[PDB]
Amino acid sequence: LAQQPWVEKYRPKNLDEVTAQDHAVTVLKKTLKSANLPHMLFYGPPGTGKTSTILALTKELYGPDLMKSRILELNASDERGISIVREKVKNFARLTVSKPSKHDLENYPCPPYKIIILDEADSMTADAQSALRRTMETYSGVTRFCLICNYVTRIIDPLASRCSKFRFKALDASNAIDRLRFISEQENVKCDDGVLERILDISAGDLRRGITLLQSASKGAQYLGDGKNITSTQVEELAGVVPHDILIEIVEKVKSGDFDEIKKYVNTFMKSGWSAASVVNQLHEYYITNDNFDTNFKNQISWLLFTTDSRLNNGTNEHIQLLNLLVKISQL
Amino acid sequence: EKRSKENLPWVEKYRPETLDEVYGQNEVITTVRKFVDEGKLPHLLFYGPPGTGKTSTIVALAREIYGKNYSNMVLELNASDDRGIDVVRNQIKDFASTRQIFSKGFKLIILDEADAMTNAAQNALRRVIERYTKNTRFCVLANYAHKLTPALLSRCTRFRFQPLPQEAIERRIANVLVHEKLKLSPNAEKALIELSNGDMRRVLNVLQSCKATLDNPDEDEISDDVIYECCGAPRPSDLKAVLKSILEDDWGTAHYTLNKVRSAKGLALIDLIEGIVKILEDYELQNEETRVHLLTKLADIEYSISKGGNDQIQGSAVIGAIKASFENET
Amino acid sequence: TLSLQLPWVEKYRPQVLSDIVGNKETIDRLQQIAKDGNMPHMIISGMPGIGKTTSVHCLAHELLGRSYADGVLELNASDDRGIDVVRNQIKHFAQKKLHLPPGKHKIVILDEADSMTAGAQQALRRTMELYSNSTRFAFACNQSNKIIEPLQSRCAILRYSKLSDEDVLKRLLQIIKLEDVKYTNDGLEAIIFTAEGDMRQAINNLQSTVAGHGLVNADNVFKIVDSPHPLIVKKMLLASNLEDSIQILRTDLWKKGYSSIDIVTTSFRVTKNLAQVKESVRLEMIKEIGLTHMRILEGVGTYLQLASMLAKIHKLNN
Amino acid sequence: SMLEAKFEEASLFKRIIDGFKDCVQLVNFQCKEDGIIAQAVDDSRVLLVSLEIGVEAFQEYRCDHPVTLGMDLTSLSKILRCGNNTDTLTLIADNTPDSIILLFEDTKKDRIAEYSLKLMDIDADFLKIEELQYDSTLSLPSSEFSKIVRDLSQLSDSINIMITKETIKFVADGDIGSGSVIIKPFVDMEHPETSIKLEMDQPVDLTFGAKYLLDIIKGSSLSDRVGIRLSSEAPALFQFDLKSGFLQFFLAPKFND
Amino acid sequence: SLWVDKYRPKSLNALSHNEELTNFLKSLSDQPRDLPHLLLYGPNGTGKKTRCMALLESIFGPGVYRLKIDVRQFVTASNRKLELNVVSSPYHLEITPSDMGNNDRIVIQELLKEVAQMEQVDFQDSKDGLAHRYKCVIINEANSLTKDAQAALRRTMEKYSKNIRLIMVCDSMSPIIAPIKSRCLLIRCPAPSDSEISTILSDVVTNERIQLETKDILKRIAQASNGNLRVSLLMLESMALNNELALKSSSPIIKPDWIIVIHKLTRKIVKERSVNSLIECRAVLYDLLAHCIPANIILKELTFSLLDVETLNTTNKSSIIEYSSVFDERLSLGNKAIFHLEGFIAKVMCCL
DNA sequence: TTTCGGGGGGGCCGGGGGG
DNA sequence: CCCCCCGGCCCCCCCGGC
Ligand SMILES: Nc1ncnc2c1ncn2[C@@H]1O[C@H](COP(=O)(O)OP(=O)(O)OP(O)(O)=S)[C@@H](O)[C@H]1O
Ligand SMILES: Nc1ncnc2c1ncn2[C@@H]1O[C@H](COP(=O)(O)OP(=O)(O)OP(O)(O)=S)[C@@H](O)[C@H]1O
Ligand SMILES: Nc1ncnc2c1ncn2[C@@H]1O[C@H](COP(=O)(O)OP(=O)(O)OP(O)(O)=S)[C@@H](O)[C@H]1O
Ligand SMILES: Nc1nc2c(ncn2[C@@H]2O[C@H](COP(=O)(O)OP(=O)(O)O)[C@@H](O)[C@H]2O)c(=O)[nH]1
Ligand SMILES: [Mg+2]
Ligand SMILES: [Mg+2]
Ligand SMILES: [Mg+2]
């Protein structure tokens, strides 16, 4: 509707609306007739469709009515301590499946089991997972488990063994362009050629970010009211991408090799609010794909960029990390 | 359960019911069978990695000893139940100190996943085990021995469950393919065994997914391509091409090749790193420094990936690490 | 099939103080106390499976004869031993009036006393002091430091040492003779080597063999009993070349099913107890092992991490 | 509906449930054309509770096909506490049911309370555990048994029952002392309800835990007398007779060692 | 009232710098019924909270500025009693969960959810008495939230988007986890230019009738603020008060006490490099930390003051910046800040 | 100092039983 | 109708390696 953001408005309603996860969606659709759904472990990068996929699977399995009494959803917003796992989850798994109605039986497959969805399971402690092990194993006849996570390494090995793994691939301009184009057409968004491809390249595997950026660009165009196609320049501006002139200036200052000049330029640059991650990514793209650098230089710069990115991922100070990275590059 | 066994996941549908259906643990199975057949069952400690057949083995042993009604003649406790010091003091002691209800016999207590129990409960269990040995025996199952107190380990006979050998996995796969009307090629079986890492759960889950992937399972044979598609794992040819490009091409060509290989099938960098590490393990390097640098840098990259981060930077880091490490061969 | 047979550990549990091997001086002292009575408050300490509970029970039985039922109060970790229990039940038992020969006293046996809380130990003090004329206390523990100093001051310290290879061989041969077990010298050597001074484990493995293979030779013993993984980890850490370390890790530890957390913890312990290596080098190796352990606890329990740990250790030792 | 069983007052069912709610947690009811047979086992697997309620106890009972309902006793008690004791109580179930409906109806007013309790998947058999020819069988007023059990439990956590020719002995040995109660068979025509009867084939001697007997004696509120059947190598059977049914406790004796 | 607060604009049309951002905010507020969750990131003191309030005033009425403070109870698993101060208006609620430290998660799992799971009674401007609009929750210092609280925010942001919209403000997106950034529309808030700061200061001076010899004085204040407009206004007020409301070309630039202490520490470190100097530096660090000076701020200012020393060479500065990066990472992952600060000072002393 | 979980020990409160 | 016994929450405090 008009009162919902595009990300929620265009959330897939059925398994056929998932864009580029066929390697798992095909098996999930097969289970509709097979009726032997195994324990599932969905994992992948942010905004790939895991939650949408499980919700659509439940929708198609039980229908709008029977779903509520057949699904138990727990996420990071709910307490999931060892006691909760040992009592509430166990009690729900021990219950008999709710009786389907005639409507449900004649119109939906109605498999003879219920589903417990532990979304964001990577946030659960190891003790809770250990408690879940035998709960899932014992009552498989009437219950099936779905664990959704971003970092699969956070799931204890026994649980990963018990579950069938599904890796959700990153969504890029090659496999997700169709969905973005469909959304743009349904929203009557006018864009220049390559704008959607640029959006998907900037999002870097996250379709939610791409849809949000498209909505922001559409809002800007509507406010302007000029009846002109959205260009890639404003798309880059909305995404926080540093202008190429600024990147070239930074590269030139680094090539100069003077500590004071680099420090002054970085101090001026940090006042614009550019995110350190975007700057590091752009510098990596510029340096790795440049032919005017030797193998040794690229070998060193790759490790320098990796170290800076790892440090930034820990929530450090952007100014200090960026200055250190630029100084180290200038000394190569 | 509900409906029938055909609705169960394959990992559960094929759970062994007798000791003759447990594969790959011949020594342990033979020893335990001899123990039960001669009335000399000691306290048991089954230590092993995931999906090796410990729970199945103990359940089958209990079924053999007590028959179908074994569920009502044994006391099974796992991490899903409360096993505090009070539980040990009251419930376990009462069970071990009392006679059977349904039929005469000795008492069996199965402390599955005993590595998740507190130290106080383990200490309380010592004299319970020692005092009621005449009529009760204890079996404890573990994946991590460091979590079990030395006193408890001293009281139990240890049986180690090795990772499943390849021939046992082939036999189980043959049985499954006989039950499920499926056709599997030798290359597909080789890839499945390679990726299983000695876990039967992985074998069964991947086989079920492969069957679901086939358009016409009755007359369609699972090939290595099907396995790699369902599992989303790199093909060996892709790993070899990536490694050859990294070790024999310029930086731009290596970057292009890595990007193309990853984009063609949407592979994850972590799987590529694992495959390259496996390939390089067999390489005969002339200098220890090369191996040291490879191992350290690749471990750092894997740890960084475990926490997320930029994927392109991580791929470039892998390329640079391999190049720098191999530059030491000279 | 439904009739269990008594394990040899319980079947051949020494019933007299003369059947206990090891700690000759302390055992003879206990025999002298039994002969002459006047047992003092005592604390027996040691490591698992050396004969502490057996010694205490044998001493109590020999001292009290047929009055064992009324004169002995046994409490262990499996029983509730809180402050209220100490104040009520133990105090009542100490205050009880019982007729015994001139040289005998009532005995309170607090097995696994290290698990008792500080408050109960505090409450036991004046009970021990005031009623010593009729009651005596025997504690058995694995870690003496858990017992508070006031209680240790009131007791006689008996720190049992590990059984030598000779004592283990003697007891094993006695059991073999009483059971008519076919064996070879190499089989006994393997059993004692794997026992690591633990009598209980030695007897358990000896029964497992014969119960499963009849003849106790080194081979048959090693088809069920695995060589202690601490020794394999020590060999891995002391290997001269990194290739040898990695080969040991792959073949003897990873391919056998040992978990990464177990391997890293064992590496920590072994490095802590490597007397032949300089302390600073050991500290650096411990730092590297701690890094690897922290990574493993986060969830990255991969063979690559252990290989990197070995590579860093070899880098340190060069 | 598949199954419909009416109690004139909810009090009877509440008292029946209260008789064994403190010893077991999960119960399984099998309802047929002959009535309701329920079984439950304690966590320690030392006590078994078997309840039988005949069709005569219901104002109106109808059960077309046998139905099995596995439930948790604490939830059932919580639900029952929500209904008044003076209202008719109807248990309703359907084919392959997923829940049991409790209907509290007050004929005085138009107040109807519907409570749905979700069933749990429990696949188990009753095994019809009952030994053919017990070594000894006695019966005596429930008040005397309860008094003896309460008196002896204060001295020890274990109670020994010995049956010999015209002699029933309850013994307890503890830290502060010991107690022994000896009773002989006797019959009084003036008040036969106070008589105790015994029939003995072989002498018996069995030890039991005090806590389990303390739980068992709670069933004295359902019957004025209690029957104890004792046999070596078999669990002791304590039976309280209802108007048209029974409540049985099978207690495993302690190992003699 | 202070000039910094007395002259804060209260509407989008009243903004005076970063006109492009103002146009973007107007475009976002044009059709607010489908406004996504917003995350404004930018340097401190630039006007992020002012712009958020202006956006809310553009969406709702001026009533967004009629604020009131309430106190909310919370109970932990151990029965500990915690208080949270909530600033609320008839249209939005403002919260700073980081005030409860590691307990912030509870606020996300109890308070926010409670707002998003229920409707509200609106007896003003609504005929039926029930609100027909989504409620806005501002989360201040969102970068201070623990990972558990951020994880808890995830499904709450999606399930109840029809009833709740979140507007978060931060000085750096590095501590924000990837899913939360993916769930938000990111808005960069650049610092005002020197000329814009000078214009604002000149307007304030004209309004306050402050005698100014030359406008360059304002310019001198603008550079000293390093793009921080709040600092600029407060420094202007302090300078005016320190010169009888009459500023001259020689009016010295006033620096805060903690900055002076950090500069003195830098001078001490440069001059003296010894263990006793390290002990004195530890005492100074303890004094700074005991008076609510964040450790990260201390490390940043000390690093930049050291890098501003003219007597140091390039190698020393490179070593200093490398150590600063390493120990900033250490601080991000540690509890005792004094330990990491002392380690950094010792490493710098060794390098010099 | 302290971000859970377990364990122990004390103080109330209240159901039930007895007089 | 009132008093006493003794089960169950409820709360507070203290470890947590070999
Ligand atoms: N495969 C997809 N197909 C279509 N839309 C998608 C897809 N993936 C993500 N989206 C879009 O992005 C929105 C969010 O998708 P999600 O299912 O929430 O992704 P997610 O992987 O569950 O996010 P995380 O792991 O909790 S950060 C959807 O409502 C869709 O609008
Ligand atoms: N030796 C085996 N032979 C046949 N199937 C096996 C074997 N081991 C594991 N499986 C299969 O994998 C499933 C799980 O086996 P489990 O007995 O649960 O392994 P486990 O070692 O007890 O798991 P952990 O240690 O609690 S993670 C079984 O139902 C079997 O289908
Ligand atoms: N010195 C010994 N001589 C003969 N048998 C021994 C000896 N020590 C232990 N055993 C045997 O091992 C069994 C157990 O001995 P224990 O007395 O329980 O050892 P423990 O040191 O008290 O164990 P802990 O400290 O509670 S783990 C005995 O029944 C004996 O059969
Ligand atoms: N004249 C004018 N003053 C502004 C503007 N934006 C911010 N300010 C002033 O700068 C002060 C600090 O702004 P604030 O939003 O609190 O900083 P932040 O939240 O850390 O980004 C405010 O008190 C305002 O007085 C603006 O657009 N025009
Ligand atoms: Mg999701
Ligand atoms: Mg198992
Ligand atoms: Mg002992």
CA B100 from chain center: how many Å? 35
- State which H helix or E strand residue A42 sits in: strand A40-43
Q: Position of tokens 């798994």? A: A93
Q: Given in angstroms, what resolution was this structure solved at?
A: 2.5
Separation of CA E49 and ligand 4 centre (Å): 7
Q: Position of tokens 């290359």? A: B187
Residues with Cβ within 8 Å of D53's Cβ and at least 6 positions away in sequence, in order, are D16, D35, D36, D37, D38, D242, D244, D245
Task: Give chain A positions within 8 Å (CB) of C300.
Answer: 153
Query: Which residues of B contribute to the annotated binding site for ATP?
Result: 11-15, 23, 48-56, 143, 201
- C144 CB neighbours strand G below 7 A: no
Cα angle: E134, vertex E137, E140; to 5 degrees: 160
- For strand D35-41 and strand D47-54, is the pairing parallel, antiparallel, or unpaired? antiparallel
Q: Which ligand is nearest to the CA of C163?
A: 3
Q: Are residues A98 and A187 in the same domain?
A: no
d(CA C258, CA B161): 10
Q: Are residues A234 and A269 in the same domain?
A: no
CB A41 within 8 A of CB A87: no
Residues with Cβ within 8 Å of D209's Cβ and at least 6 positions away in sequence, in order, are B94, B98, D46, D157, D158, D159, D254
d(CA C85, CA E14): 77
Name the D residues in 16-75 with CB < 8 Å from any A CB: 70
**For D50-82, b where at least 16 C-beta lie within 10 A, e where not — what string?**
bbbbbbebbeebebeeebbbbbbbeebeebbee
d(CA E81, CA E62): 36
Domain count, chain A: 3
The sheet that has D178-183: what strands, in order across it?
D178-183, D167-173, D158-164, D204-209
- State which H helix or E strand residue E181 sits in: helix E178-182
CB B104 within 8 A of CB C1: no
CB E348 within 8 A of CB E306: yes
Interchain proximity A281–B321, CB inside 8 Å: no
Interchain proximity C259–B42, CB inside 8 Å: no
What are the two backbone dihedrals, phi and then psi, of residue D89, each rounded to the nearest 5 degrees? Answer: -115, 115
Residues with Cβ within 8 Å of D234's Cβ and at least 6 positions away in sequence, in order, are D131, D134
Q: Which atom of ligand 3 is nearest to the CA of C9?
A: 31
Does chain E touch chain C (at least 3 C-beta pairs within 8 Å)?
Answer: no
d(CA B115, CA A262): 56
d(CA A214, CA A188): 12
Task: Give chain D's length.
Answer: 257
Q: Which ligand is nearest to the CA of E237?
A: 4
Interchain proximity D121–A94, CB inside 8 Å: yes
Interchain proximity C308–B296, CB inside 8 Å: yes
* C156 DSSP β-pair partners: C42
d(CA A141, CA A39): 11
The sheet that has B136-142: what strands, in order across it?
B74-77, B107-111, B136-142, B44-47, B157-160
Q: Are residues A81 and A220 in the same domain?
A: no
D45 touches chain B (CB under 8 A): yes
d(CA C173, CA C128): 42
E26 touches chain A (CB under 8 A): yes
What is the CATH code of the structural domain delimited by E194-247?
1.10.8.60
**Which of C6, C8, C10, C13 has the most ligand 3 atoms within 8 A of CB, as the residue to mutate?**
C13
* Last residue of one domain, picked from the residues A136, A151, A171: A171
How many Cβ atoms are within 10 Å of C32's Cβ, its own excluded? 10
CB D196 within 8 A of CB D226: no
Looking at the structure, give the CATH architecture of the domain made up of residues E3-188.
Answer: 3-Layer(aba) Sandwich (3.40)
Residues with Cβ within 8 Å of C214's Cβ and at least 6 positions away in sequence, in order, are C182, C220
d(CA C58, CA B57): 39
d(CA C54, CA C160): 12
d(CA E32, CA C206): 80
Tokens representing A282? Answer: 């752009």
Residues 122-161 of D, Cβ under 7 A from nucleic strand G: 154
d(CA B51, CA A158): 8
How many Cβ atoms are within 10 Å of E209's Cβ, its own excluded? 7
User: Cα dihedral angle (B166, B169, B174, B179), rounded to 10 degrees?
Assistant: 180
Name the C residues in 284-303 with CB < 8 Å from any A CB: 298-301
Interchain proximity D176–C92, CB inside 8 Å: yes
Residues 151-210 of D, Cβ under 7 A from nucleic strand G: 154
Residues with Cβ within 8 Å of A7's Cβ and at least 6 positions away in sequence, in order, are A208, A211, A212, A215, E36
Pure H helices in B77-199: 85-87, 93-96, 119-131, 150-154, 166-179, 186-196
Q: Are residues A136 and A181 in the same domain?
A: no
CB D29 within 8 A of CB D69: yes
Tokens representing C162? Answer: 């590990």
Name the E residues in 235-294 with CB < 8 Å from any A CB: none
Does chain A touch chain B (at least 3 C-beta pairs within 8 Å)?
Answer: yes
Q: Are residues A25 and A123 in the same domain?
A: yes
d(CA B156, CA B46): 9
Residues with Cβ within 8 Å of B264's Cβ and at least 6 positions away in sequence, in order, are B238
Cα angle: D184, vertex D185, D187; to 5 degrees: 135
Residues 4-63 of B, Cβ under 7 A from nucleic strand G: none
The DSSP line for B254-304 is HHHHHHHHHHHHT--HHHHHHHHHHHHHT---S-HHHHHHHHHHHHHHHHH
What subunits make at least 3 CB pairs under 8 angstroms with B? A, C, D
Helix (H, G, I), strand (E, B) or coil at A331: coil
- For strand B136-142 and strand B107-111, is the pairing parallel, antiparallel, or unpaired? parallel
Count CA atoms within 13 Å of residue A148 on its CB side.
22
- C269 CB neighbours strand G below 7 A: yes
Task: Give chain D positions within 8 Å (CB) of C89.
Answer: 175
Q: Helix, strand, coil: what percent of chain D each, to 5?
A: 20, 45, 35
Q: Which ligand is nearest to the CA of B47?
A: 2
The DSSP line for C70-105 is HHEEEE-TTS---HHHIIIIIHHHHH------TT--
- State which H helix or E strand residue D205 sits in: strand D204-209
Of the candidates B2, B212, B311, the beta carbon closest to that of A97 is on B2
Task: Give chain B positions within 8 Å (CB) of C257.
Answer: 47-49, 52, 160-163, 198
Q: Are residues A129 and A30 in the same domain?
A: yes
d(CA D53, CA D37): 6
Of the candidates D44, D129, D257, the beta carbon closest to that of B95 is on D44
Q: Is C69 exposed, middle or buried (0-12, 13-18, 19+ CB in 10 A)?
A: exposed
What are the two backbone dihedrals, phi and then psi, of residue D33, each rounded to the nearest 5 degrees? Answer: -75, -15
Q: What is the DSSP letter of C252?
A: I
Q: Is the dihedral of CA E324, E330, E331, E336 positive or negative?
A: negative
SS (H, E, C) B174-213: HHHHHHCCCEECHHHHHHHHHHHCCCHHHHHHHHHHHHHH
- B90 CB neighbours strand G below 7 A: no
* B76 DSSP β-pair partners: B110
- C143 CB neighbours strand G below 7 A: yes
CB B108 within 8 A of CB B74: yes
Helix (H, G, I), strand (E, B) or coil at D245: strand
The DSSP line for E244-310 is TTEE-TT-PPP--HHHHHHHHHHHHHHH--SHHHHHHHHHHHHHHHHTT--HHHHHHHHHHHHHT-T
Cα angle: A256, vertex A259, A265; to 5 degrees: 80
Cα angle: E238, vertex E242, E246; to 5 degrees: 100
Tokens representing A161? Answer: 């063994």
Separation of CA A44 and ligand 1 centre (Å): 11
d(CA C242, CA C252): 15
d(CA B58, CA B111): 10
* Last residue of one domain, picked from the residues A212, A241, A270: A241
Tokens representing E168? Answer: 């978060």
CB A208 within 8 A of CB A9: no
CA B66 from chain center: how many Å? 28
Q: Are residues A218 and A167 in the same domain?
A: no
Give me the residue spans of the domains in chain E: 3-188, 194-247, 257-351
**Which residues in B have their CB inside 8 Å of a CB on D?**
1-2, 69, 72, 75, 90-91, 94-95, 97-102, 104, 132, 134-135
Q: Are residues A12 and A71 in the same domain?
A: yes
Task: Give chain B positions within 8 Å (CB) of C209.
Answer: none
**Which of E17, E196, E221, E229 has the most ligand 4 atoms within 8 A of CB, as the residue to mutate?**
E229
d(CA C265, CA C281): 18
d(CA C33, CA C39): 6
- Nearest chain D residue to B102, by CA: D129
CB E64 within 8 A of CB E89: yes
Task: Find the distance separating the first CA and the last CA of chain D, reported in whole Å.
Answer: 54
**Which of C141, C200, C205 has the most ligand 3 atoms within 8 A of CB, as the residue to mutate?**
C200
Nearest CA residue ID for atom 14, ligand 2: B51
**Which of E205, E230, E233 has the most ligand 4 atoms within 8 A of CB, as the residue to mutate?**
E230
d(CA E245, CA E224): 20
What is the CATH code of the structural domain delimited by E257-351?
1.20.272.10
Give me the residue spans of the domains in chain D: 1-257
How many Cβ atoms are within 10 Å of C303's Cβ, its own excluded? 18
Long-range pairs, C68-72, Cβ under 8 A, ≥24: C70/C98, C71/C98, C71/C100, C71/C104, C71/C105, C71/C106, C71/C107, C72/C106, C72/C107, C72/C108, C72/C109
The sheet that has A164-167: what strands, in order across it?
A71-74, A114-119, A143-149, A40-43, A164-167
d(CA C313, CA C307): 10
- State which H helix or E strand residue C189 sits in: helix C185-195
Q: How far is the CA of D76 from the C1' of F14 (A)?
A: 22
- Measure C89 CA to nearest chain D CA, in Å: 8
Task: Give chain C positions within 8 Å (CB) of B288.
Answer: 241-243, 314
Range of the domain at A139: 1-171
Residues with Cβ within 8 Å of C11's Cβ and at least 6 positions away in sequence, in order, are none
How many Cβ atoms are within 10 Å of B196's Cβ, its own excluded? 22
Q: Position of tokens 């230089």? A: A297
- Nearest chain D residue to C72, by CA: D175
Tokens representing A200? Answer: 């998907």
Task: Give chain D positions within 8 Å (CB) of C72.
Answer: none
d(CA C112, CA C137): 13
What are the two backbone dihedrals, phi and then psi, of residue C201, each rounded to the nearest 5 degrees? Answer: -65, -40
**How many helices and strands, by DSSP H and E, does chain E display?**
15, 9
Name the A residues in 170-229 with CB < 8 Å from any E CB: 206, 208-209, 212, 215-216, 219-220, 222-224
d(CA E157, CA E253): 46
What are the CA-CA distances from residue B206 to residues B139, B211, B237 (Å)? 31, 9, 21
Give me the residue spans of the domains in chain B: 1-164, 165-233, 234-330
Interchain proximity E174–A208, CB inside 8 Å: no
Does chain E touch chain D (at least 3 C-beta pairs within 8 Å)?
Answer: no
d(CA C302, CA A287): 32
Q: Directed axis angle between helix B311-326 and helix B251-265, to 10°?
A: 130
